[PDB]
């Protein structure tokens, strides 16, 4: 088994929390840097990916760290966002984070694919005539 923590360590006044609203994770807690550490939940190792974005517009990006036990999935909202926010701010839709944990052994029940945040940010819309949107 393992436990995994998460935290943005942002550079602004944003990301109010919502929460989550088969092989389910138990819960998530907030210690309010600004760690959003969950409790243990596991199915299998060898695949681990955090997906930030939205699939209605087919736009997302993937973060794959590990410090293994416990995991760290830090998500900087200053440098590691390029044009996802500029789509997210026009039409107000909550961007999502989703956890992938699986492997090849034939345990269909023991697979994990479920979003565990529904966050909503407001830093700035801030079009700088960045053409590469539409």
């Amino acid at each position: 088994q393992d436990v995994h923590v998460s935290f943005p360590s942002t550079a602004g006044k944003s990301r109010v929390m919502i929460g989550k609203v088969e092989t389910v994770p138990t819960t998530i807690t907030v210690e309010d840097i600004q760690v959003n550490f969950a409790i243990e939940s596991t199915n299998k190792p060898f695949q681990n990916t955090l997906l930030i974005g939205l699939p209605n517009k087919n736009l997302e990006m993937a973060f794959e760290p590990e410090i293994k036990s416990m995991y760290k999935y830090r998500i900087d909202l200053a440098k590691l966002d390029a044009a996802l926010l500029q789509e997210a701010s026009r039409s107000p839709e909550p961007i999502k984070a989703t956890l992938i944990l699986a492997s090849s052994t034939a345990k269909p029940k023991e697979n994990l694919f479920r979003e565990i945040l529904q966050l909503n940010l407001n830093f700035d819309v801030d079009h700088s005539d960045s053409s590469l949107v539409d």
Partner: protein, 59 residues
């Protein structure tokens, strides 16, 4: 004197007094006109270089 890529010479007079250059029409595949001139002009720097590039998200 380095070479230019986006223009090309069309007429140049007898005692080199008037020189007339013409804008080169845009590239038919989206490539920047500096990169195609560097590709043609320098047939050296051959390599394998199997590494993934750093791209933004296709939006």
């Amino acid at each position: 004197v380095p070479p230019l890529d986006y223009f090309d010479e069309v007429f140049t007079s007898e005692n080199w007094m008037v020189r007339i250059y013409q804008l080169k029409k845009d590239d038919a595949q989206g490539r920047t006109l500096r990169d195609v001139g560097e590709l043609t002009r320098s047939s050296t720097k051959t390599r394998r270089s199997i590494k993934r590039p750093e791209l933004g998200l296709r939006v």
